Amino acid sequence: METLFSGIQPSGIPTIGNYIGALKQFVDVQNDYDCYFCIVDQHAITMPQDRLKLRKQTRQLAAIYLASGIDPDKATLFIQSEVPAHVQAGWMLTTIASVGELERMTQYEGIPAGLLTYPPLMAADIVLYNTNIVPVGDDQKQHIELTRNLVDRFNSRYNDVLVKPEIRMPKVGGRVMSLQDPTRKMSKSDDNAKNFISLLDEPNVAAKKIKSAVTDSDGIIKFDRDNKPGITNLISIYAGLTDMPIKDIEAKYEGEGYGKFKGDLAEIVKAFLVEFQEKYESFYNSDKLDDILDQGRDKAHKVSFKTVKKMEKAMGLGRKR
Amino acid sequence: METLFSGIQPSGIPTIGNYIGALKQFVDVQNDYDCYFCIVDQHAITMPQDRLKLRKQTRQLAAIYLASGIDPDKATLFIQSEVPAHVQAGWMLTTIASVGELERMTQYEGIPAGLLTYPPLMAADIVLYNTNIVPVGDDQKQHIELTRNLVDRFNSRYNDVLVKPEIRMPKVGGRVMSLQDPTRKMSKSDDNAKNFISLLDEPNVAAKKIKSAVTDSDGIIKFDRDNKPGITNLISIYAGLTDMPIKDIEAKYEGEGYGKFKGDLAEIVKAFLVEFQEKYESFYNSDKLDDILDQGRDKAHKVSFKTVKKMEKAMGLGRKR
Ligand SMILES: O=C(O)[C@H]1Cc2c[nH]c3cccc(c23)S1
Numbered sequence: 001m002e003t004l005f006s007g008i009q010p011s012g013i014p015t016i017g018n019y020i021g022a023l024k025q026f027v028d029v030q031n032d033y034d035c036y037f038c039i040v041d042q043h044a045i046t047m048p049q050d051r052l053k054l055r056k057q058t059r060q061l062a063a064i065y066l067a068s069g070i071d072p073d074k075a076t077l078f079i080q081s082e083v084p085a086h087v088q089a090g091w092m093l094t095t096i097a098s099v100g101e102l103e104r105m106t107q108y109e110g111i112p113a114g115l116l117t118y119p120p121l122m123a124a125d126i127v128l129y130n131t132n133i134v135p136v137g138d139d140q141k142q143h144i145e146l147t148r149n150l151v152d153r154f155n156s157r158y159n160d161v162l163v164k165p166e167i168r169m170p171k172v173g174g175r176v177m178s179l180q181d182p183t184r185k186m187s188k189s190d191d192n193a194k195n196f197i198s199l200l201d202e203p204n205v206a207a208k209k210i211k212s213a214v215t216d217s218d219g220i221i222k223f224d225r226d227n228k229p230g231i232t233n234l235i236s237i238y239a240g241l242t243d244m245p246i247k248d249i250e251a252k253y254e255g256e257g258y259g260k261f262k263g264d265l266a267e268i269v270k271a272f273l274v275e276f277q278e279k280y281e282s283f284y285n286s287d288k289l290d291d292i293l294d295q296g297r298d299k300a301h302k303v304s305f306k307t308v309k310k311m312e313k314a315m316g317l318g319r320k321r
Numbered sequence: 322m323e324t325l326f327s328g329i330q331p332s333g334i335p336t337i338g339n340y341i342g343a344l345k346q347f348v349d350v351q352n353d354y355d356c357y358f359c360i361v362d363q364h365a366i367t368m369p370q371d372r373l374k375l376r377k378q379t380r381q382l383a384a385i386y387l388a389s390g391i392d393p394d395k396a397t398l399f400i401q402s403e404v405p406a407h408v409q410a411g412w413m414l415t416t417i418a419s420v421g422e423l424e425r426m427t428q429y430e431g432i433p434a435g436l437l438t439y440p441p442l443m444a445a446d447i448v449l450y451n452t453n454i455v456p457v458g459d460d461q462k463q464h465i466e467l468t469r470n471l472v473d474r475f476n477s478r479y480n481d482v483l484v485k486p487e488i489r490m491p492k493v494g495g496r497v498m499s500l501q502d503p504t505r506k507m508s509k510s511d512d513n514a515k516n517f518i519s520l521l522d523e524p525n526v527a528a529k530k531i532k533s534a535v536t537d538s539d540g541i542i543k544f545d546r547d548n549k550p551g552i553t554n555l556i557s558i559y560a561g562l563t564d565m566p567i568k569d570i571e572a573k574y575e576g577e578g579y580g581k582f583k584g585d586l587a588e589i590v591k592a593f594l595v596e597f598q599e600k601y602e603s604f605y606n607s608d609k610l611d612d613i614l615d616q617g618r619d620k621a622h623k624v625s626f627k628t629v630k631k632m633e634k635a636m637g638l639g640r641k642r
């Protein structure tokens with residue numbers, strides 16, 4: 001079975017685009033892949049962070065992943081700083097990286113040093129779990145390239161202990177675009193809040209955003225990206241939330257206009273978030289959340305400890321006991 | 322009681338100059354100061370290292386410190402990589418350092434990144450134990466300046482958790498110079514092996530080095546650095562190993578020439594190393610060495626864990642449990 005590793009920034013609430021694109025797919029692929037979902041709070045502090053904002057965000061992301069259906073027995077859901085192997089292996093790989101290499105990553109008071117030195121910690125996050133696949137986007141290609149190069153360098157210089165990962169998302173979800181800018185991807189950090197639907201948006205507010213999505217006044221319910229990106233994006237959201245095939249959606253709304261479709265979709269979005277946020281609040285406000293995060297931490301520690309120890313022996317750190 | 326922290330490079334055997342200058346003084350000040358003696362194997366790998374050379378060197382330094390009289394109950398003698406707090410706190414301080422700051426430290430395949438990023442780990446080594454004094458030389462002034470600045474930055478930005486250290490050696494030992502270059506300090510890495518006496522030199526070989534020290538053919542036994550640095554350096558070694566006051570040495574050898582003094586000193590050096598190396602071999606070849614290093618690791622972990630947890634809470638890493 002292949003191992004998947006995904007790093008999760010505690011720096012913002014995922015949107016329904018992130019849910020349709022990734023989170024919902026993780027809920028299915030966690031049965032067929034050995035999945036690690038790591039809330040990277042040590043990467044988060046490379047940026048300026050408010051320390052209560054950060055601890056709250058971490059719990060929030062954990063709760064959102066659990067509310068999505070991420071299963072702490074099937075997958076390993078943990079907080080990066082709670083597993084020392086990450087900075088242990090991150091330091092080991094730093095020593096074999098070059099300054100030039102790190103500087104070229106930064107391209108693709110002063111400048112905080114974490115912004116230059118985090119890539120070997122990213123590599124460590126991945127290779128500690130013998131990861132085969134990382135489900136990231138084009139913006140992370142250089143980081144995986146460096147990861148693979150560090151693995152090759154480590155194995156070449158000391159001896160074979162580390163596995164090279166590939167960029168692969170096992171089941172790509174639909175691409176969800178900005179509701180009032182259909183040519184750009186939906187983003188949680190938009191300055192136009194009508195562009196995205198947050199998973200923690202009030203369900204009535206989300207339904208209004210479906211209604212304020214920028215489309216023609218009326219038309220047929222047909223999937224057509226290049227000519228009607230507005231209604232097409234909504235069809236994608238509809239398909240992402242109901243699992244109805246797109247051709248099935250077109251056949252269901254044959255002879256219908258936009259108002260009926262957008263009305264049904266707004267109610268679908270509202271019902272989805274009502275159900276999602278009830279699970280979210282129950283995890284977020286429960287004592288079991290710390291029990292779950294402890295269990296995930298212990299699972300990750302068990303696996304990454306052996307990797308760290310193999311690395312330490314290969315470099316000659318510590319003792320032979 | 323003040324806390325002292327000394328980092329120990331596992332990269333070479335200390336000389337009798339290092340013994341007279343530092344190690345012997347540590348054996349006394351460990352009664353009056355809370356001393357941490359940390360074998361920094363994670364700093365060692367910032368340089369190119371042979372991995373069996375490194376693990377052996379680490380054990381060797383531990384044994385040399387114990388053979389010197391460093392007492393694992395009075396002081397805390399441990400290996401850096403065995404205490405995760407060092408890289409945990411090292412990463413936290415990295416995020417508040419600036420690239421410019423780190424680059425200016427480097428001044429005072431490519432360039433290994435550890436050579437740029439190690440200073441915040443040095444700062445972490447120190448401040449984890451609430452250190453008041455660090456017994457280092459002029460070459461480390463920039464590193465302590467950065468340490469103090471990182472502590473100020475950390476306390477200013479988050480809240481008061483870290484203590485600023487000072488450069489202070491509580492009891493300075495004698496300065497021991499190169500045996501065949503009396504104007505330079507003795508150094509374990511000299512290309513002229515007659516210049517230094519290693520603590521692991523064969524005792525007969527050391528006695529020959531006392532005899533091959535560069536001095537006048539003959540003279541009085543008088544301490545005179547500027548005019549007779551050769552015999553003066555030998556008087557310093559004699560004083561360092563016997564604790565005989567220098568004026569007492571001059572009075573003892575009134576009416577004596579160099580051959581009698583150098584003969585007595587060579588025999589003193591030989592007897593010292595015979596006794597030193599018997600203790601060294603017994604520690605180096607004993608099973609108790611791992612017991613001792615475990616105990617030191619546990620002592621250091623207990624203290625540095627609390628510091629790390631205070632730092633994590635201040636930055637908002639992890640969870641409030
Ligand atoms: O910001 C992001 O999306 C990246 C954050 C991150 C840290 N460590 C890993 C490992 C695998 C994947 C990712 C990450 S994704």
Ligand SMILES: O=C(O)[C@H]1Cc2c[nH]c3cccc(c23)S1
Nearest residue numbers: 326327328330361364443446455
């Ligand atoms: O190379 C050396 O001498 C330095 C190595 C080192 C690493 N971390 C500390 C903390 C205090 C003092 C020192 C060190 S001395």
